[PDB]
Symmetry: C4
Subunit: 221 residues, 4 copies
């Protein structure tokens, strides 16, 4: 009977149908946002969603028997699996965080549809030749986040009171958002040489970013 | 009589004269801005504009007989047509929006003048090899917009209360404008882990943008 | 006697001496900033500056006789000439604007020193292959500045009340500084669809900028 | 006895052990941040750090005898030396700044570990072909900083009252952070033409930055 199901799963119909449900589920997730829609089609959608998750679980089971070990060595299948699994965890209990993670299922449209797979794949394959720089950077933040914490945390708890608060603030400085009016001008009211810390940090972190980008451009060419 | 008009329309004079009116109309559209100018040359300009639109309709009609079906398969002509048409719709009625859309007529100067066409044409030809990434991105926003709405909309109606309000805010976050001081720092006063939603969102949306640009550079070569 | 001066002007000494004065003048311009310095070396510097301008005028005269027509066909000499001329206009009269323009003389260090000339020259030579895009852009701002003025000027005079105010505000939007929190969120309190005007404007103006940069990168390669 | 130590220092063990201490020291420097941790493991950590600095000084001494003059002509060793030296300066006296500079020791992890060296080395090698543009820029800031001081310092002491205050503000304008809402819009309330100073400054400083980046991309190829 193995081959009987394999010619179902491997069919065009099967894929087209799933892709069809992804888009339907996606559309319905956005309608589930409208307070108006939910007082009308309230029960309608509550059932429609328990229906779709069933079809998807069936799909992932069928896909598993047709593929066995190959299934759990496909990044895309694993994504489909974990995403369907999250959706399976009961609507209540623990925190509601899981209920929100459901909408990550709509990334199945990247899985189920080729060409989408293609771009995601092209985008991701660029990451490996970055990890040496990403590591350098992370070490860099960590060194500066520790300095910032012990230089500015006492008088500026909100922004630098904690290693993590300093990571957060430095990230903001890196994105250059309000770094002068919001952070360094206030800081200099107490610590007039604070600029000696932040101008260099901005130069280095900016410089590295520019190189990181150059990398990706020259290497693709 | 066909050829009699065709040697008019196709002449050097004809185009030079239209290009002349474009610039004349354009200049006059900026003077129609001055509150001072309109209390003086008020009626003067009101007539000058009704004249120009006539010459332009004549122009588009003459251009149609000389070109027939070819006219309506030329992007530039279609633009010229639709732009003259918007201008034809009566000054009153409906909304005043149309009255504003008239100034889009000055993009004719891109049509009537070569070299302008050339650049616009080059800029546009880059769009096709982007639609997959633009598509990816749009899906991405949509997934994150739906999550933000159900995670932050209750306590932050202005920014996340609505799927579209969430779209707008996320776009702003993408441009990185006030994203920490204006949005995430306030958000964290209620949801201390909000950063888990926005730092990743920023990385992904930035990363993709950086690639989107790389694309255009290497591919142009 | 022509050759007598030509072997002065064309000497290394001559150039080295002028470059020496540029740097001295430059240093002294920054000291002329200190309120402390000016109550001490007040008269000292007032004379030192009238001295330097004399030596420079002599220099530009000597350079002219050794070069005649070639002098006024050298961009660099013309700069040196006009910059020395501005410095010659009496300290008083008209407005003080001229007194400030003096410090532009320190760009003589770009003239008098090669290698500096080289970079300025490389940087400028990139401009010609941009004017078609710069023109497109300027037309673009002009069309949108006029729309913004007649759409938002009434209720938002400070930002959009004038064609120029609209140019200014749109430039700010283009640099993406406070565009949402500072301009478009306030605007939407009155005009809820204002986003239909600014999101497109941001896309187009951003898109063009990215291409403008691609241009310069691919063309150099 | 020379070779006896040389086969220690040059061993795989030696480096692995140092790299181990770097990471151990590094981790412990972040725990020294927790107010909680220090009331518990207070004395524990105070000793652990005096131990590590000893091992590191021994390390740098052993490395010196095995390398002598070659040691002091290796950038990385010089760094390791100066970084260990800063750490040697007593916890008290002068300012506490030195105590903070200790954490710069964690950049050793870049030294002791290859591949890190590799990236840092690649990033740095790009700097030489920039110094002409960095030089141009610095001259540029200096010229505009002096002008801003004498044009805006009187009525705007905080932002332009001082050559250095002007440098800082102009850098902020260069990063484009709050430049219109925070600086030029306020400035124009007194000096309606201030925009003539800042829009050009922004164009030039942006233009140069765009070229600076182009440089690194084409030249890397
Ligand atoms: C290639 C190198 C990459 C470097 C990796 C950087 C990752 C660092 C993540 C640290 C997360 C910060 C956690 C946090 O914000 O809580 C603050 C607490 C103080 O809280 P408190 O309530 O005061 O106790 O304070 C702390 O949490 C102190 C925790 C410090 C943990 C040390 C992290 C490992 C660093 C290893 C790399 C060092 C190499 C030199
Ligand atoms: C090129 C790539 C550049 C790499 C830049 C390195 C990432 C720096 C930006 C990420 C750090 C960050 O976003 O801060 C978030 C947390 C803060 O922990 P938290 O305890 O919540 O701090 C209190 C702040 N609060 C409550 C208001 C949220 O931060 C932490 O707890 C510290 C651990 C952050 C993970 C480091 C990321 C690994 C690199 C990828
Ligand atoms: C920051 C830098 O922007 P900034 O230099 O401030 O731009 C102006 O903007 C950023 O946060 C960039 C963070 C590093 C970008 C590369 C990290 C890629 C890892 C995430 C990609 C995964 C999606 C496939
Ligand atoms: C400023 C920003 C630009 C907006 C200026 C307003 C322009 C209005 C006219 C639209 C321009 C246009 O339709 O270009 C189509 C080009 C034709 O290139 P082509 O001459 O066929 O080579 O591309 C094609 O190849 C045809 C594609 C159909 C669109
Ligand atoms: C779809 O959501 O767009 C329509 C919504 C409609 O506006 P709306 O959601 O009704 O509320 C906006 C604020 N308000 C009340 C003042 C009007 O308004 C918006 O959503 C406009 C802002 C989102 C547009 C940007 C989304 C672009 C996706 C990213 C693709 C670009 C990658 C190259
Ligand atoms: C997964 C597969 C792809 C699925 C894409 C299908 C998108 C359709 C989503 C329709 C949901 C719109 C909606 O519910 O309106 C939200 C609120 C209504 O407020 P309300 O409480 O009813 O008053 O008012 C609004 O904000 C109206 C504006 C809604 C913007 C919808 C834009 C969605 C474009 C996403 C395209 C993604 C392509 C992959
Ligand atoms: C902007 C985000 O820039 P961002 O990465 O936040 O800048 C830092 O926001 C954007 O750049 C989104 C727009 C990306 C440009 C591609 C969209 C196509 C533009 C259509 C232009 C028509 C040609 C005349
Ligand atoms: C390739 C095309 C490039 C387009 C060039 C764009 C250059 C536009 C510069 C206009 C300068 C604005 C002057 C200004 O802000 O004063 C505001 C006055 C109203 O003041 P008010 O006190 O009310 O009298 O209102 C006015 O000044 C009205 C003045 C409008 C002058 C028209 C400018 C020439 C446009 C020619 C290009 C049109 C081609 C279609
Ligand atoms: C790629 C290159 C992108 C090209 C972008 C086009 C330039 C747009 C940015 C320049 C426009 C601008 O900065 O606005 C300044 C003036 C405003 O005149 P204004 O009468 O002072 O307006 C009142 C505002 N106030 C008193 C507070 C200063 O604006 C005007 O009076 C209108 C004329 C501006 C000159 C247009 C620049 C030519 C393109 C180079
Ligand atoms: C604006 C675009 O920055 P934005 O897209 O907002 O960056 C984020 O930033 C700008 O204002 C760029 C204006 C166009 C840059 C090219 C204009 C070059 C003419 C000036 C160069 C003369 C100096 C030799
Ligand atoms: C030279 O002016 O730098 C030293 C000045 C000294 O700080 P200071 O001028 O005494 O006042 C800064 C504000 N305050 C009172 C709170 C300390 O402080 C500063 O000037 C720091 C800010 C200017 C540094 C940025 C200048 C970089 C030139 C652009 C070159 C980069 C192109 C790649
Ligand atoms: C033309 C050829 C190149 C000339 C370069 C020579 C630069 C030397 C300028 C020295 C002027 C410094 C100064 O006057 O101090 C300003 C105020 C004093 O406040 P005060 O009223 O005395 O109390 O307090 C401060 O702000 C001190 C900070 C002054 C920063 C000076 C940085 C100049 C670096 C420019 C390098 C350009 C290379 C081409
Ligand atoms: C930033 C200005 O970026 P901006 O053009 O305002 O961004 C938009 O401010 C800057 O990007 C100025 C710094 C340019 C990077 C070149 C300076 C050399 C950095 C030295 C890094 C040492 C390598 C580890
Ligand atoms: C195309 C129209 C007439 C239409 C026709 N059928 O001939 C031409 C009539 C006069 C021409 C301008 C001028 O001559 C030379 C300029 C310099 C350079 O060339 C770049 C562009 C020019 C502005 C140019 C633009 C365009 O070309 C026209 C408007």
């Amino acid at each position: 009977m193995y081959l009987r199901i394999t010619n179902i799963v491997e069919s065009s119909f099967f894929t087209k149908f799933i892709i069809y449900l992804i888009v339907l589920n996606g559309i319905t997730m956005g309608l589930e946002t409208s307070k108006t829609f939910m007082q009308s089609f309230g029960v309608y959608t509550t059932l429609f969603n328990q229906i779709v998750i069933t079809i998807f679980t069936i799909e992932i089971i069928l896909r598993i028997y047709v593929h066995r070990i190959s299934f759990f060595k496909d990044p895309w299948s694993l994504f489909d699996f974990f995403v369907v699994a999250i959706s399976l965890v009961p609507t209540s209990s623990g925190f509601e965080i899981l209920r929100v993670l459901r909408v990550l299922g709509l990334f199945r449209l990247v899985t189920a549809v080729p060409q989408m797979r293609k771009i995601v794949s092209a985008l991701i394959s660029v990451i490996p030749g970055m990890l040496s720089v990403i590591a350098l950077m992370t070490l860099f933040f960590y060194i500066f986040a520790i300095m910032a914490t012990q230089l500015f945390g006492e008088r500026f708890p909100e922004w630098f009171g904690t290693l993590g608060e300093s990571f957060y603030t430095l990230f903001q400085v890196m994105t250059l958002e309000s770094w002068s009016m919001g952070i360094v001008r206030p800081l200099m009211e107490v610590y007039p040489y604070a600029w000696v810390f932040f101008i260099p940090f901005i130069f280095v972190v900016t410089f590295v970013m520019i190189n990181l980008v150059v990398a990706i451009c020259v290497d693709a060419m």
